[PDB]
PDB file of C-alpha atoms in Angstrom:
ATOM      1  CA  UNK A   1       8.508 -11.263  14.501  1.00  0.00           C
ATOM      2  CA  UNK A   2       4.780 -11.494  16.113  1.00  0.00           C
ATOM      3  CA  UNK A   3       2.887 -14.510  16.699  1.00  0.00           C
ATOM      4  CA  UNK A   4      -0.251 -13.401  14.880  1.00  0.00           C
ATOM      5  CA  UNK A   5      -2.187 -16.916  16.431  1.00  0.00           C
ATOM      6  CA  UNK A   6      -1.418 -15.727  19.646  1.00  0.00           C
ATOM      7  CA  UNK A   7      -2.233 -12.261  19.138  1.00  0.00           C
ATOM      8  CA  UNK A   8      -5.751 -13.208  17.302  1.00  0.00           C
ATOM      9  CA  UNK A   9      -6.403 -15.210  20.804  1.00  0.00           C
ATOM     10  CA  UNK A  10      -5.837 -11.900  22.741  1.00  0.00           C
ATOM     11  CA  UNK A  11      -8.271 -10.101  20.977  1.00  0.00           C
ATOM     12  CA  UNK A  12     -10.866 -12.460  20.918  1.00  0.00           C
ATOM     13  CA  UNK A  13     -10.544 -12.671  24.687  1.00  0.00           C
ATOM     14  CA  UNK A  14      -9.948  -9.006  25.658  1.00  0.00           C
ATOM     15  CA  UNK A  15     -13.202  -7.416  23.604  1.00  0.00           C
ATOM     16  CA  UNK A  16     -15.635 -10.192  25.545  1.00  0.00           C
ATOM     17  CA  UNK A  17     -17.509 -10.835  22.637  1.00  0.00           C
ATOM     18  CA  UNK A  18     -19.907 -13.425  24.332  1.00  0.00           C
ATOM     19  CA  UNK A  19     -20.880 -10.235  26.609  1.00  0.00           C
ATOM     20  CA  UNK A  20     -22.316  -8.564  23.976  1.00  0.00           C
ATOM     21  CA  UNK A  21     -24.126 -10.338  21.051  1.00  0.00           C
ATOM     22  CA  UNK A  22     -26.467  -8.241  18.798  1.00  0.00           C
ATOM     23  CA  UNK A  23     -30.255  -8.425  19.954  1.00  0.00           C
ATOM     24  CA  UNK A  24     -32.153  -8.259  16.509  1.00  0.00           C
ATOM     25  CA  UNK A  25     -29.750  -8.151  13.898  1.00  0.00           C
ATOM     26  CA  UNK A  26     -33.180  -8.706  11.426  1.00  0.00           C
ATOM     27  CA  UNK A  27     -35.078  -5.409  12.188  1.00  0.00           C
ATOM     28  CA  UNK A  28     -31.261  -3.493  12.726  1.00  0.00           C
ATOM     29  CA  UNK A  29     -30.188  -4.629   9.039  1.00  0.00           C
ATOM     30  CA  UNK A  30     -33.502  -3.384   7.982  1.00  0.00           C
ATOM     31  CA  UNK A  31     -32.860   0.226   9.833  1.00  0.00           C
ATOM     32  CA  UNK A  32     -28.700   0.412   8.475  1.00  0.00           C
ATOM     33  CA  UNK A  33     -30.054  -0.288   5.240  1.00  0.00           C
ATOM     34  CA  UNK A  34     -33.029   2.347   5.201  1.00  0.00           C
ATOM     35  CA  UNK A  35     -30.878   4.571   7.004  1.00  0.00           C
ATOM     36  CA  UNK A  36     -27.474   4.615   4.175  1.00  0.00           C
ATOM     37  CA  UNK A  37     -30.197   4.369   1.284  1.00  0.00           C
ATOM     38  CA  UNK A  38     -31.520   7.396   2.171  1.00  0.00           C
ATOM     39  CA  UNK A  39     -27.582   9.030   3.013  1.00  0.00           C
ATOM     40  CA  UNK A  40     -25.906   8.262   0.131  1.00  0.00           C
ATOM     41  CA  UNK A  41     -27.954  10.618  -2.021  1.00  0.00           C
ATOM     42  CA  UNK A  42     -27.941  13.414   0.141  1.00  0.00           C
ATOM     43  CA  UNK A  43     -24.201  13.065   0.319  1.00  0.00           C
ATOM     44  CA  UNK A  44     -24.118  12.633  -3.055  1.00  0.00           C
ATOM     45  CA  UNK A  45     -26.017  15.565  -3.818  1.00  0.00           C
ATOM     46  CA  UNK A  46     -24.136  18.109  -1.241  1.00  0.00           C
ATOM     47  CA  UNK A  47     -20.946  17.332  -2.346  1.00  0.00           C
ATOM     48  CA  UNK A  48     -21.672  16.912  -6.040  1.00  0.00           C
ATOM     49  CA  UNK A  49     -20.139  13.420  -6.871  1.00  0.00           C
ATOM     50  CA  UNK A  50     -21.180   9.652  -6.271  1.00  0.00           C
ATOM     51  CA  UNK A  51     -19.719   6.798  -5.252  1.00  0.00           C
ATOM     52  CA  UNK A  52     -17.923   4.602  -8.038  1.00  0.00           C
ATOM     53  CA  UNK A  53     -19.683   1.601  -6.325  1.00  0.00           C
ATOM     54  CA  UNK A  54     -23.303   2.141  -4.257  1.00  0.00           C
ATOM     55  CA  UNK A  55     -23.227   0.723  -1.053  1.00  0.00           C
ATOM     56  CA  UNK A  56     -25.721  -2.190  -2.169  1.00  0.00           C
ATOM     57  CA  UNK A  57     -24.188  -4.209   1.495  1.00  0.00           C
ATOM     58  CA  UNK A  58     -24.875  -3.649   4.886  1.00  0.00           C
ATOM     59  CA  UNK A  59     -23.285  -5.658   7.992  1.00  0.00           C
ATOM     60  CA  UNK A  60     -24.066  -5.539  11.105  1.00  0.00           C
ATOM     61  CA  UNK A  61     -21.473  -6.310  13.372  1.00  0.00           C
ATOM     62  CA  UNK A  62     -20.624  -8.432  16.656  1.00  0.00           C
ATOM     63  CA  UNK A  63     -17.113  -7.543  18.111  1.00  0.00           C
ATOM     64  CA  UNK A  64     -16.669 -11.545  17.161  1.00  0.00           C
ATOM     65  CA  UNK A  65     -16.593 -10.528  13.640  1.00  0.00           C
ATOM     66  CA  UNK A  66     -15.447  -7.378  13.511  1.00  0.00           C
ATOM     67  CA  UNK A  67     -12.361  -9.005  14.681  1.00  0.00           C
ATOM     68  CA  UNK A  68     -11.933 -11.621  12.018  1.00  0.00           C
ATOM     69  CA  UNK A  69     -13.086  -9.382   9.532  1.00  0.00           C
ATOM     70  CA  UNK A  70     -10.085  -6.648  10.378  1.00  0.00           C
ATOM     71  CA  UNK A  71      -7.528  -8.915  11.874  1.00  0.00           C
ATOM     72  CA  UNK A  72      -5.610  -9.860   8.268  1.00  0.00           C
ATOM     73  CA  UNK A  73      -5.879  -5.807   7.108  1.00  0.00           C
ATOM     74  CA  UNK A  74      -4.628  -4.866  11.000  1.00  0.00           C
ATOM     75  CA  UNK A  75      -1.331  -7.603  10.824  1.00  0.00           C
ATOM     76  CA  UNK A  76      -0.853  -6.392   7.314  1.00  0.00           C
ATOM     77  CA  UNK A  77      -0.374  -2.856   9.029  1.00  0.00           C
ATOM     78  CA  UNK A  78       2.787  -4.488  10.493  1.00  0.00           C
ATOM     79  CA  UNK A  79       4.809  -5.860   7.338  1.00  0.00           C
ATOM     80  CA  UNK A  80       6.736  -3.252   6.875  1.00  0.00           C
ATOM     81  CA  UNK A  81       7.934  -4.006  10.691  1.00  0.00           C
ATOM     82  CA  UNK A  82       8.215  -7.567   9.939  1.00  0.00           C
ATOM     83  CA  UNK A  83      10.082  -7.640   6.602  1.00  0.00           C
ATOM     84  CA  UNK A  84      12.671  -4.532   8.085  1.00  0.00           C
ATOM     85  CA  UNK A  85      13.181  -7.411  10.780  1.00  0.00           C
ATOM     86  CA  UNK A  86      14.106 -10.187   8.298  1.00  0.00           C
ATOM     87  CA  UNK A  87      16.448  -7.745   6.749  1.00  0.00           C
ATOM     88  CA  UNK A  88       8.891 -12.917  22.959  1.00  0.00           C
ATOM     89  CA  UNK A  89       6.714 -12.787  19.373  1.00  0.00           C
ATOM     90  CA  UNK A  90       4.224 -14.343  21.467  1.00  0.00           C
ATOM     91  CA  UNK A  91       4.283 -11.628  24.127  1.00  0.00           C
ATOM     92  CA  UNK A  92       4.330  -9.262  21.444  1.00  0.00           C
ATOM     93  CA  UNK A  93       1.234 -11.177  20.239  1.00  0.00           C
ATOM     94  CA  UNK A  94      -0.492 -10.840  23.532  1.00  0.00           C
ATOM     95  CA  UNK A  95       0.344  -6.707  23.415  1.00  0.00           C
ATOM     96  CA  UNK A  96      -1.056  -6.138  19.801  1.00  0.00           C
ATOM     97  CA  UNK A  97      -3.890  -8.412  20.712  1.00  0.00           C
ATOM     98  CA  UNK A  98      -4.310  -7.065  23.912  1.00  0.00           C
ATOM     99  CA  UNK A  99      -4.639  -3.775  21.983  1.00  0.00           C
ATOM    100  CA  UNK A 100      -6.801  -5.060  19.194  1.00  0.00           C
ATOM    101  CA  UNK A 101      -9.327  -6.692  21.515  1.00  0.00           C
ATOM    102  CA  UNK A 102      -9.663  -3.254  23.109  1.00  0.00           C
ATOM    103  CA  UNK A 103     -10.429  -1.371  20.002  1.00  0.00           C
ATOM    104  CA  UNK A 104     -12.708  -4.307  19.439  1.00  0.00           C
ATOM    105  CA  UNK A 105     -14.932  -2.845  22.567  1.00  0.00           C
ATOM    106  CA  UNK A 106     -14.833   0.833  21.273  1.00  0.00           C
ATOM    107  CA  UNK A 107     -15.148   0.692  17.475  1.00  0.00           C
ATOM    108  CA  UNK A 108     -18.182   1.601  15.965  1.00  0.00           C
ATOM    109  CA  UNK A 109     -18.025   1.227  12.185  1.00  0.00           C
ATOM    110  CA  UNK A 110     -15.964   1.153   8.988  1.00  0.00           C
ATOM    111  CA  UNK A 111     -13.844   4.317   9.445  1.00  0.00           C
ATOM    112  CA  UNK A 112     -12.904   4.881  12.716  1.00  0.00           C
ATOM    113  CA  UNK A 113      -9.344   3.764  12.343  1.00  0.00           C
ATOM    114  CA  UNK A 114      -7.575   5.624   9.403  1.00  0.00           C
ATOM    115  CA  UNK A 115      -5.101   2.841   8.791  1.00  0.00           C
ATOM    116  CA  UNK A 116      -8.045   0.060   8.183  1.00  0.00           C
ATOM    117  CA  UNK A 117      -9.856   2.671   6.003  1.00  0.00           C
ATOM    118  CA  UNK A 118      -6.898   3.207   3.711  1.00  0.00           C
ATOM    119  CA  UNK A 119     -16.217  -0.280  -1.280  1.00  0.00           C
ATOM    120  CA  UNK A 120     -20.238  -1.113  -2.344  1.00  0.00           C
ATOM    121  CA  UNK A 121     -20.402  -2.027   1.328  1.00  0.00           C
ATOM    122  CA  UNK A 122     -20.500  -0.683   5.265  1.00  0.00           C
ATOM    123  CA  UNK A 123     -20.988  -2.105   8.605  1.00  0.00           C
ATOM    124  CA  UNK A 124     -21.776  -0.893  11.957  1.00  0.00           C
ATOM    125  CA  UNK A 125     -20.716  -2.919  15.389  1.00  0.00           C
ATOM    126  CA  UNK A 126     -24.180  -2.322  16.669  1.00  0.00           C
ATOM    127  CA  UNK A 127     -23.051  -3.694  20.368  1.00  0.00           C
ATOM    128  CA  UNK A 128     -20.415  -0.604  21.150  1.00  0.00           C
ATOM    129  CA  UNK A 129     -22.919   2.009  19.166  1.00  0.00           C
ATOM    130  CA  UNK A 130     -25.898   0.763  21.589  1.00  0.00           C
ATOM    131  CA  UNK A 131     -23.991   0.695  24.584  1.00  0.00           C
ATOM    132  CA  UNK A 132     -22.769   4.677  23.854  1.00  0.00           C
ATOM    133  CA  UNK A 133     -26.285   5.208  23.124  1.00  0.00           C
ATOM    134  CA  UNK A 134     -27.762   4.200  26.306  1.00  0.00           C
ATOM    135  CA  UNK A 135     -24.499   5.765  27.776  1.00  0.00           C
ATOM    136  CA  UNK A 136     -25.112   8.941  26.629  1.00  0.00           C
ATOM    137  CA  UNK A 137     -29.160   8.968  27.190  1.00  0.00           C
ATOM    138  CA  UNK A 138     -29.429   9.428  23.230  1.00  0.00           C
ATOM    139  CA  UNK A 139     -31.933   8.475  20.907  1.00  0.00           C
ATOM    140  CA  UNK A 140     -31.994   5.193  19.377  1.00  0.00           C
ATOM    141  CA  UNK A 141     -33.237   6.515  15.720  1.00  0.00           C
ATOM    142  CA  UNK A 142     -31.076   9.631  16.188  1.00  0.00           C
ATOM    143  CA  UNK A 143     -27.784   8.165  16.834  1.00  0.00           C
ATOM    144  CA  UNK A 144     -27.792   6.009  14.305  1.00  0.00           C
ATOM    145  CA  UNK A 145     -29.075   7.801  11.440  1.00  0.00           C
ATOM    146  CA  UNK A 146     -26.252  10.434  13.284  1.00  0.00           C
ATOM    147  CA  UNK A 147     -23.480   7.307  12.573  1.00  0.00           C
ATOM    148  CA  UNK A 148     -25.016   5.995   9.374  1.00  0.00           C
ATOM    149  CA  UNK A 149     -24.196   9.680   8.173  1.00  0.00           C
ATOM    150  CA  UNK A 150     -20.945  10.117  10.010  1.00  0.00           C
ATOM    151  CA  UNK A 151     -20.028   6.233   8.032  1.00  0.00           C
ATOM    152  CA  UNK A 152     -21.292   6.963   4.317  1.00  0.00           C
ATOM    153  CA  UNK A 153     -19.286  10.422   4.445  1.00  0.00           C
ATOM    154  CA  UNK A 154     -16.358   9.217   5.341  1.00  0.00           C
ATOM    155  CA  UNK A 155     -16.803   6.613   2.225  1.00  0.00           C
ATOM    156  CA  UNK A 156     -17.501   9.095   0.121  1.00  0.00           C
ATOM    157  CA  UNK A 157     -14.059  11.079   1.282  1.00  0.00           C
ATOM    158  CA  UNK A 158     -12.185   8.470   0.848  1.00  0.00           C
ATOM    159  CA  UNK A 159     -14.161   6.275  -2.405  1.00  0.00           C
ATOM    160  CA  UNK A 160     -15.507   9.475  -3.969  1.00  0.00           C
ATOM    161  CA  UNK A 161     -12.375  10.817  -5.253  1.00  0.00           C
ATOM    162  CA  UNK A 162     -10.106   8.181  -6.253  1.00  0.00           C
ATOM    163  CA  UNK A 163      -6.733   9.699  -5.649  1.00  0.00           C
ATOM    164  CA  UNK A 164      -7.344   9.773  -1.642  1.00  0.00           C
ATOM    165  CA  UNK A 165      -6.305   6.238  -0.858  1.00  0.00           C
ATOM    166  CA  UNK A 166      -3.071   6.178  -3.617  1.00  0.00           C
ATOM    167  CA  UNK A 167      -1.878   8.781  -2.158  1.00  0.00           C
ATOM    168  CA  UNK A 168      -2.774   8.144   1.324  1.00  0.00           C
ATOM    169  CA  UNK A 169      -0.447   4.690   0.617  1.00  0.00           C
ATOM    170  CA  UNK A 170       1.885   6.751  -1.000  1.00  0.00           C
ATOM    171  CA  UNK A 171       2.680   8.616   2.220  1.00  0.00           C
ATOM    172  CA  UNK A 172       2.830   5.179   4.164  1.00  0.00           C
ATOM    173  CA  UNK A 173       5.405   3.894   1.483  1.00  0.00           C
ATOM    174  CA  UNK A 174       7.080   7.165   2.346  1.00  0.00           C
ATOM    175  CA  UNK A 175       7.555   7.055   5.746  1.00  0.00           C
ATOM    176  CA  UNK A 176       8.986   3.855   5.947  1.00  0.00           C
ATOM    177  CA  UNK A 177      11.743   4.557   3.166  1.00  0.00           C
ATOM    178  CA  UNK A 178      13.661   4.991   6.920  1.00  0.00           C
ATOM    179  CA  UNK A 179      14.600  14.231  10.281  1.00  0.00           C
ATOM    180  CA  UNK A 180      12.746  17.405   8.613  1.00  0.00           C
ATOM    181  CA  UNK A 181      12.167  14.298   5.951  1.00  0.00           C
ATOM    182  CA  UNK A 182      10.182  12.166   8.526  1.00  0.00           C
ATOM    183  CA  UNK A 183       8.309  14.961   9.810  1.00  0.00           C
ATOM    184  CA  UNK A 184       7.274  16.132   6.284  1.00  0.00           C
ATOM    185  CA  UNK A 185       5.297  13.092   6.004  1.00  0.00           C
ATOM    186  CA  UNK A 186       3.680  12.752   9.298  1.00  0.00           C
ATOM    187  CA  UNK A 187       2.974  16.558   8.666  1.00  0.00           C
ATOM    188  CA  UNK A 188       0.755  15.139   5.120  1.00  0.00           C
ATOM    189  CA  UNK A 189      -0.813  12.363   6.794  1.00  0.00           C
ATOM    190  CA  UNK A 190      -1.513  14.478   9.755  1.00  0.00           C
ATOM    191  CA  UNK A 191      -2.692  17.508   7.414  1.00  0.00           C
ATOM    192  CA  UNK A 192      -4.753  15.026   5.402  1.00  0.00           C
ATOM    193  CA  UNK A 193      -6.518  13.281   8.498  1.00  0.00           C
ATOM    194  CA  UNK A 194      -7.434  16.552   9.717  1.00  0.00           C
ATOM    195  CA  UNK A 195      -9.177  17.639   6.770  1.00  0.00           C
ATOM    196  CA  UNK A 196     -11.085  14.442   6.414  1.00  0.00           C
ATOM    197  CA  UNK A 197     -12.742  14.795   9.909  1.00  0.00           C
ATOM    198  CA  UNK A 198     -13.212  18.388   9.357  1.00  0.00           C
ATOM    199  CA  UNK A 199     -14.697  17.888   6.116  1.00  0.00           C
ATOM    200  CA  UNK A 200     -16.546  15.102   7.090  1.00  0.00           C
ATOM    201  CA  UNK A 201     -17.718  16.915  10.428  1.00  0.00           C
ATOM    202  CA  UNK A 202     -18.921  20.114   8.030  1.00  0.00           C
ATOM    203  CA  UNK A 203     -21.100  17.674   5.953  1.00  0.00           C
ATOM    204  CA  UNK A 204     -22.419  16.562   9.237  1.00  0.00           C
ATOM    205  CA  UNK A 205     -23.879  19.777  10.243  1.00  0.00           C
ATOM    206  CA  UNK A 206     -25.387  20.760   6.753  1.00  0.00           C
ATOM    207  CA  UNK A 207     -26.797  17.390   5.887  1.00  0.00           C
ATOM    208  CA  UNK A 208     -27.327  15.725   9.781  1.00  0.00           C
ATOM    209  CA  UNK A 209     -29.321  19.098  11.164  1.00  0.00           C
ATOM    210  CA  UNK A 210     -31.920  19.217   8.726  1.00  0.00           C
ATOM    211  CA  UNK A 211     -32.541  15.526   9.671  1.00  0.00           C
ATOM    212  CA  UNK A 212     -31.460  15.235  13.379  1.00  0.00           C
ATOM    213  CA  UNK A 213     -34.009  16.882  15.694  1.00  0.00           C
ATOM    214  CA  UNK A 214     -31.129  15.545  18.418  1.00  0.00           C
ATOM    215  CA  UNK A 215     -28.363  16.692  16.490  1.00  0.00           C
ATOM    216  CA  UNK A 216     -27.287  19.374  18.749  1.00  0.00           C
ATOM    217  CA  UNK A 217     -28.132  17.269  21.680  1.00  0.00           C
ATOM    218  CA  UNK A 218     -25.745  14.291  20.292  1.00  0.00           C
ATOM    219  CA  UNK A 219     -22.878  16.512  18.734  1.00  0.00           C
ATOM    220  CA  UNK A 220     -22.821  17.572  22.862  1.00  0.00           C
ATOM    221  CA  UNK A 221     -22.780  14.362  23.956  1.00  0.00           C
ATOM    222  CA  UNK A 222     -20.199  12.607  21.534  1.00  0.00           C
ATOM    223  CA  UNK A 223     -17.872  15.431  22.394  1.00  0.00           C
ATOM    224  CA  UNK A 224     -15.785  13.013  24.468  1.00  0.00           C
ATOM    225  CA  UNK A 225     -16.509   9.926  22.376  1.00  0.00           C
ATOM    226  CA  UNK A 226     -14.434  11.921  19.572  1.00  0.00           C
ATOM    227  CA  UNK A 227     -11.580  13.154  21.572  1.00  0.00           C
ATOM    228  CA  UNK A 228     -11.262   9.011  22.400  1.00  0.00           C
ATOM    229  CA  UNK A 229     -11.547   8.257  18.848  1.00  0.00           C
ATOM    230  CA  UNK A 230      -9.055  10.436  17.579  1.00  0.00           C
ATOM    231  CA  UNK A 231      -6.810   9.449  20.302  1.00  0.00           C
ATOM    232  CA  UNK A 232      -7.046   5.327  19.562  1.00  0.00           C
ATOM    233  CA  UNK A 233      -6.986   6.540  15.785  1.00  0.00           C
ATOM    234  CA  UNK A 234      -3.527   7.562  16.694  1.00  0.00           C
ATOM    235  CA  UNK A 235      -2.538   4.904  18.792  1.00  0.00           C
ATOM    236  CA  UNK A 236      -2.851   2.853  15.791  1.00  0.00           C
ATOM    237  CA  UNK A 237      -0.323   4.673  13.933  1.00  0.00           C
ATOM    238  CA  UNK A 238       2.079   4.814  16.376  1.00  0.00           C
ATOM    239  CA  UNK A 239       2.040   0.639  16.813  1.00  0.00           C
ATOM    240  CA  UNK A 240       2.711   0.451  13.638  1.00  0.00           C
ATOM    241  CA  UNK A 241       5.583   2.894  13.645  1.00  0.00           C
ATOM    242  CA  UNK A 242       4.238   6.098  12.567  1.00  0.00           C
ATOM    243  CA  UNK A 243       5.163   8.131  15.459  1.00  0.00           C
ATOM    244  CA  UNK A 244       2.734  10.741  14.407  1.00  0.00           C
ATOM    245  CA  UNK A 245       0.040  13.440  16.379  1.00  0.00           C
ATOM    246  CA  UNK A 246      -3.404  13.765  14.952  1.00  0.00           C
ATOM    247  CA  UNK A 247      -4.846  16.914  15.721  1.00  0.00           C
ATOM    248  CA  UNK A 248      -7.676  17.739  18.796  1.00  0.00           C
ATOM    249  CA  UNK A 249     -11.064  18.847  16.427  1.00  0.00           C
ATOM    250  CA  UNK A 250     -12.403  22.154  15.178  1.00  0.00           C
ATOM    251  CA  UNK A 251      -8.714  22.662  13.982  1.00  0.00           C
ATOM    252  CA  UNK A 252      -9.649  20.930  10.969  1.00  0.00           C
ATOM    253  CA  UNK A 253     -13.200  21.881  11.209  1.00  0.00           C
ATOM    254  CA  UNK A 254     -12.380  25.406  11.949  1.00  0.00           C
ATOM    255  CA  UNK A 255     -10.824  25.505   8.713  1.00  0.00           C
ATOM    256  CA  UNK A 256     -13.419  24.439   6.921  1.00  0.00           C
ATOM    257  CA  UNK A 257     -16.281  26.369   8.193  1.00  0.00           C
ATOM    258  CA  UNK A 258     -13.874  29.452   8.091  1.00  0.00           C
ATOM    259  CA  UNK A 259     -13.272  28.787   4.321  1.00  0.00           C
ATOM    260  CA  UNK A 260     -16.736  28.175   3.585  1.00  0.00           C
ATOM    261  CA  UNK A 261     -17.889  30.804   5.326  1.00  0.00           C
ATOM    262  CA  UNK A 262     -15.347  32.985   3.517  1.00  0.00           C
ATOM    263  CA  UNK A 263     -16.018  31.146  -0.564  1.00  0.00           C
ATOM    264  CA  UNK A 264     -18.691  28.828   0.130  1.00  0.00           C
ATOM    265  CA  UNK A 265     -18.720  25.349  -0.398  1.00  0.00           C
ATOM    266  CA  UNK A 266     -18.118  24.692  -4.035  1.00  0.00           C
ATOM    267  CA  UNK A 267     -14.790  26.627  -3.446  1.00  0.00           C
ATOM    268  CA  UNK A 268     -13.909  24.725  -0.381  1.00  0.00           C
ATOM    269  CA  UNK A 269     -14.701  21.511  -2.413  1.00  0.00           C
ATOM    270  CA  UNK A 270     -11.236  22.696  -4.441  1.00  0.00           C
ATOM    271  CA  UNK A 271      -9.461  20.264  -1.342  1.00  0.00           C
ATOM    272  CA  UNK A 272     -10.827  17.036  -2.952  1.00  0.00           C
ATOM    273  CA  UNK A 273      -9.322  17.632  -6.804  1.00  0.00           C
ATOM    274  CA  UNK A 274      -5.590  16.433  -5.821  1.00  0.00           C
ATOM    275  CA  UNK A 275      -3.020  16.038  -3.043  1.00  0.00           C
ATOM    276  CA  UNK A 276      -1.691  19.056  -3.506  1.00  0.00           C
ATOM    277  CA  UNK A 277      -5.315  21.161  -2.889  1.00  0.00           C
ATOM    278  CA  UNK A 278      -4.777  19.969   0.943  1.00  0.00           C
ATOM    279  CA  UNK A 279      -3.774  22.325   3.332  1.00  0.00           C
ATOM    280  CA  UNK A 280      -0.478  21.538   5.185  1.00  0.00           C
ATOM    281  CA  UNK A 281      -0.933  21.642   8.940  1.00  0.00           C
ATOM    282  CA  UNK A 282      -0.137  25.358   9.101  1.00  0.00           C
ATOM    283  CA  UNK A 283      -2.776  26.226   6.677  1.00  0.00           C
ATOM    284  CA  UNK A 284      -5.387  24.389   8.464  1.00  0.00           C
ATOM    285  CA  UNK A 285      -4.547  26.660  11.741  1.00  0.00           C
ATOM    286  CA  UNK A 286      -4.907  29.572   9.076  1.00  0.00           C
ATOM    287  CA  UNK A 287      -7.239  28.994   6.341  1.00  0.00           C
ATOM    288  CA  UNK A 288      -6.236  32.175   4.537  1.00  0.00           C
ATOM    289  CA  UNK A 289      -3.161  31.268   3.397  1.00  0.00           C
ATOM    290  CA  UNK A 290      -4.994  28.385   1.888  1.00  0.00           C
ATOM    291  CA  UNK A 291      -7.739  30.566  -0.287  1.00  0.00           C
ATOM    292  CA  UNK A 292      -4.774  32.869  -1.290  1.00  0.00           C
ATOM    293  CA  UNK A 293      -2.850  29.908  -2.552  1.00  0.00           C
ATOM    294  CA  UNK A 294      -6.143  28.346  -3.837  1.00  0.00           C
ATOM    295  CA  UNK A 295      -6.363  31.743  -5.635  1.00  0.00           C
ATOM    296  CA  UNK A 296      -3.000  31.460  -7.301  1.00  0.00           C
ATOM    297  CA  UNK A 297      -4.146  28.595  -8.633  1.00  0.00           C
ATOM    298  CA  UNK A 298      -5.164  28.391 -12.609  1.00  0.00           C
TER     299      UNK A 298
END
């Protein structure tokens, strides 16, 4: 159905890798790797578990390899597409490619697409997280100590509790068995991508302040950055044919700085023990409901 050749040309040509080659990839392995040795363990420590594998790898990334690294994963997103087709694919090449070589410019690490993070390793496309550095007039320690942090919580949220990612591809298998059906499913994956930046977003603030003398400075200035991420985040499950809305931000946040302002974190922590400890969308616009049910619980 799609020329994946052509569509791996696209990309390579639409993110203009030759513009913008790492300068010191030496002394910027050296930083990423200070910078996650010192993370993990305060992750680890603030939300009481560890990672089954340490993040003994660091890679720092070109938008060259970023590309061939994430290519396979990103045409693998389509084979539920391609197989329901069994049962023109050049210019649908040169679309997805198109698309792909554009992420390629904006990506910044490991988990900013959902759908490629569904371990013992991270990398960071040091290029695009310069370039929204010196955008933004931000600090160059800052930032990425700020993305290092954003990049080992979201692998402990999705590594640290194993059931995350089987059920995560549960609810892909789900939606494509084919409706209140369809829209219970994008409502889970929706509910469940929420709470991961929220969560991840709360972590931020009581592990990235202590260390970040920028923090508020950066959390101001990455305001748009994140309203673009969440937005391309999307866009990726849509291509693929999950027709689905993320939500804005604090919506998932809100509801877990209202909860933990409410219980605390250990009792807010009750999210990560199962599928069914998320909130559904509604309960993430009213937290409440969720402690009450959390309550019933036992």
């Amino acid at each position: 159905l799609i020329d994946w050749e052509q569509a791996r040309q696209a990309a390579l040509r639409l993110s203009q890798w030759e513009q913008a080659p790492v300068d010191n990839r030496a002394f910027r392995r050296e930083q990423y790797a200070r910078m996650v040795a010192l993370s993990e363990p305060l992750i680890a420590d603030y939300l009481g578990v560890r990672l089954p594998e340490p993040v003994s790898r660091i890679f720092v990334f070109d938008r060259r390899e970023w590309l061939e690294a994430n290519i396979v994963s990103f045409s693998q997103l389509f084979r539920p597409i391609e197989e329901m087709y069994e049962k023109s694919s050049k210019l649908l090449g040169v679309q997805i490619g198109g698309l792909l070589g554009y992420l390629a410019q904006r990506v910044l690490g490991q988990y900013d697409l959902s759908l490629l993070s569904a371990g013992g390793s991270l990398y960071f496309v040091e290029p695009n997280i310069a370039r929204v550095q010196q955008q933004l007039g931000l600090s160059d320690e800052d930032f990425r100590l700020w993305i290092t942090l954003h990049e080992m919580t979201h692998a402990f949220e999705f590594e640290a509790y194993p059931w995350v990612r089987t059920y995560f591809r549960e609810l892909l298998e789900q939606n494509f068995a084919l409706t209140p059906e369809q829209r219970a499913v994008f409502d889970r994956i929706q509910a469940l991508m929420s709470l991961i930046e929220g969560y991840g977003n709360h972590v931020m603030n009581a592990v990235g302040r202590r260390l970040l003398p920028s923090f508020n400075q950066i959390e101001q200035q990455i305001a748009q950055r994140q309203r673009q991420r969440t937005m391309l985040d999307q866009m990726v499950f849509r291509l693929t044919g999950l027709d689905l809305k993320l939500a804005q931000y604090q919506q998932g946040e809100a509801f877990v700085n209202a909860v933990v302002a409410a219980r605390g974190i250990q009792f807010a922590s009750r999210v990560w023990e199962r599928p069914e400890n998320l909130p559904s969308m509604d309960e993430i616009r009213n937290p409440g409901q969720w402690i009450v049910r959390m309550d019933r619980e036992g």
